Each structure stands twice: as C-alpha cells, then as structure tokens.
Amino acid sequence: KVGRLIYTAGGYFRQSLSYLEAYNPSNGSWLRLADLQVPRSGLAGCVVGGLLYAVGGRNNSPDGNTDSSALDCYNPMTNQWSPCASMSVPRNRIGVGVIDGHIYAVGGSHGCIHHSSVERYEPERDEWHLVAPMLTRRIGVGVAVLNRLLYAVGGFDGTNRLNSAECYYPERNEWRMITPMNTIRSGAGVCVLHNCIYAAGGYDGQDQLNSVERYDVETETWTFVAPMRHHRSALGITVHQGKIYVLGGYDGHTFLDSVECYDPDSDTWSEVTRMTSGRSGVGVAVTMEP
Ligand SMILES: COc1cccc(S(=O)(=O)N(CC(=O)O)c2cccc(-n3ncc(C(=O)O)c3[C@H]3C[C@@H]3c3ccccc3)c2)c1
Numbered sequence: 540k541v542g543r544l545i546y547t548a549g550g551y552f553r554q555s556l557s558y559l560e561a562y563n564p565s566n567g568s569w570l571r572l573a574d575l576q577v578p579r580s581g582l583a584g585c586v587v588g589g590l591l592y593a594v595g596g597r598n599n600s601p602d603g604n605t606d607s608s609a610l611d612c613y614n615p616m617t618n619q620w621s622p623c624a625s626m627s628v629p630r631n632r633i634g635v636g637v638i639d640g641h642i643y644a645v646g647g648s649h650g651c652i653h654h655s656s657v658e659r660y661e662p663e664r665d666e667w668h669l670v671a672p673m674l675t676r677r678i679g680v681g682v683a684v685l686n687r688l689l690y691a692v693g694g695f696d697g698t699n700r701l702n703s704a705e706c707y708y709p710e711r712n713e714w715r716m717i718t719p720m721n722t723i724r725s726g727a728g729v730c731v732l733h734n735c736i737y738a739a740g741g742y743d744g745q746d747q748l749n750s751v752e753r754y755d756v757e758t759e760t761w762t763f764v765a766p767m768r769h770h771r772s773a774l775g776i777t778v779h780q781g782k783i784y785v786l787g788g789y790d791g792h793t794f795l796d797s798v799e800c801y802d803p804d805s806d807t808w809s810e811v812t813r814m815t816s817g818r819s820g821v822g823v824a825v826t827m828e829p
Contacts (some may be wrong), residue, residue, distance in 0.1 A: 543779065544661060545564065545786075546826065547560050547562070547581075548593050548821060548823070549578065549580055549582050549596060549777055549822055551581075551818055551819050552817060553575050554601065554725065554819045555597065555598045555820075556579075556580065556595070556766060557574040557579075558571070558815075558819060559572040559574060559575060559816070562814075563828070564780070564811070569815055570617055571653070572613075572829060573613070576620055577598055577611075578598050578636050580597060580599060580612040581597050581632040581633065582596030582633065583596075583635040584824035585635050586760055586825060586826045588661060589595055589826055589827055590612050591612070591614075593610070593611045593628065593822055594609075594610055595608070595635075595647055596630075596631055597629075597632075601690075601829055604676075604773070606631045606808075608629045608630065608758040609622070609625055609626075610624060610625060610642075615828065616829070620829050623662075624660070625667075626644055626655065627656070629649040630647030630648070630649065630654060631648045631678070631753070632646075632647065632680075633680075634646055634680040636682045636684040636692075637684060637802060638684055638707075638709060638746070641661060641662075644659075644660070645677070645680055646673065646677040646691065649775040653678050653685055653695070653696055653697040654678070657707070658672060660691075670709075670712055671707070671712045671714060672714075673691055673714050673797050674715075675696055675701065675705065676696045676787070677693070677694030677695070678697075678756075679693070679725040680694035680740075681724070681729025681738055681741075683729045684731065687709070688707065688708060689707040690706040690707075690711070690717070691705050691706075691707070692720070692723055692724070692727065693720060693723070693741060698745075700723045700743060701723060701724075702724065703722070704719060704823055706735075708763070711798075717754065719761075721763065722741075722748065723744050724740070724741030727739060727748070727772075728774045728785055728788075729776065732783055733777050733803065734755060734756060736754040739767060739774065739776060739801075742772040742813070745768050747771055747772045747788075749766040750766045751763065751766055751801070765784060765806045765807055768772065768799055768808055768810060769788075769791065769795055769799065770791065771785065771790055771795055771797075773787075773797075775817070776823060777823045777824060777825055782801060783801040784800050786823055793817060794819050795808060795814070795817050795819075797813060797814075798810070798814060
C-alpha cells in the first residue's frame with residue numbers, strides 16, 4: 540500500500556496541456572514526469588496493472604480543436620508513454636471506469652455529436668469493442684465503478700444538463716436508470732468511497748457548484764455531504780487511503796490550483812496542497828511512484 544502517488548495528466552489553461560505531474564500525500568511533494576505525446580483536456584485517467592492510461596479528450600490549441608480517440612499508456616518504471624489501440628470514435632469530455640482489468644470509455648463529444656456509445660478495452664489483447672450504449676447521450680459525464688457495476692452520472696445531452704444517472708450490468712450488457720441526483724451536474728467529479736458513488740461539484744447550467752452528494756447503492760438514495768471550500772467544474776477526482784481528493788477545475792473566475800481532501804469519518808474537507816499551476820479538465824489516477 541505504500542509508495543502510491545496521485546497522478547494528474549493533461550488539462551486546460553488557455554489551451555490544452557501536456558503535463559504529467561504526480562503528488563505524494565505522504566510528504567507533500569510534486570514531481571514533473573514525461574509529457575503526454577499530445578496535449579489533451581477533457582480526458583480521463585485510470586490504472587490497470589500498475590500502468591496509467593490517458594483516454595480521449597481534445598487538443599484545443601491556437602491552430603485547432605481536435606477531439607481524441609487516443610488511448611496512451613504511461614509506465615512509471617520507465618517514465619515513458621506508449622500508444623495503445625485507439626477507440627472507435629473521438630470522445631472529448633469522457634468518463635472512464637475499470638471493471639476486472641477492462642477499461643470502459645463512456646460518452647463524450649465529437650464536434651456537435653453527443654455520444655451515448657460505450658466501448659471496452661482489453662489490455663492483454665490491445666483491442667477495443669463496443670458494448671451496449673447508455674440510455675442517454677452524455678458528455679461531461681462522471682463515471683465510477685463499485686462492486687463490479689459501472690455508473691454514469693450527470694453530464695450534458697446536447698440540450699440540457701442532467702441530474703439523471705444510470706448503471707451498467709456487465710453480465711446482461713444492459714443499462715438501467717438509477718435514482719437521479721438532487722442537483723443537475725455537468726462536469727462533476729465522480730468517484731467511489733466505501734459503499735457510495737460521490738458526485739462533487741460540476742456546473743448546473745447557472746453556476747459552478749461546491750456541493751457534494753453521494754448515492755448509496757443499497758438504499759438508492761442521494762444524500763448531500765459537507766460542501767467543498769471551492770466551487771468547481773471540470774475538476775479531477777480520485778480516492779486514496781479512504782479519502783477523496785479533488786484537483787483543480789474552474790470556479791467561474793479562476794482556473795484553480797487548489798487540491799482539497801475529504802475525510803468521510805469527520806465529514807470535512809481540507810486544503811492539502813496546490814498544483815504547480817491552475818488548470819481544469821485533467822485526468823487523474825493513482826499508482827506506484829516512478
Ligand atoms: C471557460 O473555459 C473552460 C472552463 C472550464 C473547463 C474547460 S475544459 O477545457 O477543461 N473543457 C472544455 C472542452 O472540452 O472544450 C471541459 C472538459 C470536461 C468537462 C467540461 N464541462 N464542465 C461543465 C460543462 C458544461 O458546460 O455543462 C462542461 C462542458 C462539456 C460542456 C459544454 C460545452 C459547451 C457548450 C455546452 C456544454 C469542460 C474550459
């Protein structure tokens with residue numbers, strides 16, 4: 540369990556970014572690691588087998604906006620990125636989750652197209668295949684996995700921001716609606732802690748949010764917990780040693796460098812570190828130090 544870092548990849552400030560940086564909660568240090576081969580914002584990060592994956596996004600640059608179908612793999616042992624097989628379609632503002640060593644890519648946008656499609660990556664075979672699509676088109680969708688079920692939360696369907704959510708049951712290759720959130724959220728951070736799916740922040744169509752609510756998969760209720768100190772949309776999120784960490788985002792005025800940490804035992808947030816520069820739309824995941 541020792542030696543794990545919080546990795547943040549890509550993001551946005553003025554343009555899409557190629558940064559890969561890793562925070563050590565044990566000593567407060569940040570490390571700058573190998574840049575992404577292509578700058579990307581609106582991507583998602585995940586880890587399988589100790590390897591860090593960067594999935595989808597968009598390269599917003601002065602000379603273009605290119606939505607990404609890319610899957611790239613970072614090995615901390617080598618400090619090198621390697622391309623993997625690309626997805627069927629570009630997916631900006633994507634959500635991803637891992638079930639039993641397989642990466643699920645959910646939703647996202649391609650130009651004005653809002654995807655309901657979903658595809659699954661097999662790392663050993665380096666292949667993507669489409670699975671059943673969601674019941675709703677969703678970009679800026681939050682995704683997390685609990686008890687080998689995959690949850691897609693909120694987002695934007697092309698017309699409305701959403702409080703709805705749904706769950707994918709792999710053995711039936713089927714999606715079902717779950718209880719909707721209390722709050723409309725696009726671009727929230729979604730993660731799993733204990734027996735709940737948490738949705739932190741986002742944009743409700745009017746303001747960036749500091750509220751946080753959690754879905755109890757047993758009781759099927761959404762309950763608010765303590766709000767974050769900072770309102771933020773397009774934040775990064777992960778869980779580490781029983782606590783939630785939120786990284787960066789946009790508060791309506793500033794691209795935040797703030798990293799906050801939620802303690803579920805006390806139901807409190809605290810500010811634990813700052814990123815090296817403010818940014819939004821990062822991918823985040825946890826694995827061993829390089
Ligand atoms: C002012 O500049 C910025 C401020 C913050 C972030 C960024 S971003 O570069 O990181 N980026 C932006 C990109 O992909 O082009 C991005 C990435 C992931 C999630 C979201 N996100 N969060 C809420 C909503 C919403 O409006 O419902 C959306 C975004 C998708 C939805 C949207 C966009 C346009 C019109 C309607 C709806 C955005 C830029």
